[PDB]
Design a binder for this molecule. Structure first.
Ligand code: NX7
Length: 171
């Protein structure tokens, strides 16, 4: 049984208890914290690609009203985000299991852009998700895993200064 764990869940939970926010820019902004995943139970000799996408956790637009995030009343369906390929992909199971898989180079944007960057909708709430894709072998296989601890709202600037302070304290 293939096992997926969040590295530094301690710290993600402090962000989650405040409602986490991630900046999006036209050119794209790297994440803090960085999603880092512990993986065991891969075939060390099998080939795999690690993919990252962002599920829209609800269908609403959120707004920071009198020190509190509150959802809009007008849900619209949210099309899936594009997928980010971990740049170590494709690689042997041994490679992925020798250290936490760190998505340090993904950039979050608000604008449809050349390559790499993932476009999110500002003021929507997102739940990061990975796919582990067994490649090159005969039988293709996908294992997916969500990380509720890593939920955030996409923002063009921070609203809750408690988030601002935590971001700086721990970076
Ligand atoms: O063949 C690829 C791929 C890659 F793994 C790295 C660069 C470009 C690619 F199309 N993948 C299999 C499904 C998910 C990623």
């Amino acid at each position: 049984e293939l096992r997926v764990g969040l590295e530094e869940s301690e710290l993600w939970l402090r962000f989650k208890e405040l409602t986490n926010e991630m900046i999006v820019t036209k050119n794209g902004r790297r994440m803090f914290p960085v999603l880092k995943v512990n993986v065991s139970g891969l075939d060390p000799n099998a080939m795999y690609s690690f993919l990252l996408d962002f599920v829209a956790a609800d269908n609403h637009r959120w707004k920071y009203v009198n020190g509190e995030w509150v959802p809009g009343g007008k849900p619209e369906p949210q099309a899936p985000s594009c997928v980010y390929i971990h740049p170590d992909s494709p690689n042997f199971g041994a490679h992925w299991m020798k250290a936490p898989v760190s998505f340090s180079k993904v950039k979050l944007t608000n604008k449809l852009n050349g390559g790499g960057q993932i476009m999110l909708n500002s003021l929507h709430k997102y739940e990061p998700r990975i796919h582990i894709v067994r490649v090159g072998g005969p039988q293709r296989m996908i294992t997916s895993h969500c990380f509720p601890e890593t939920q955030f709202i996409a923002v063009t600037a921070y609203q809750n200064e408690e988030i601002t302070a935590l971001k700086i304290k721990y970076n």
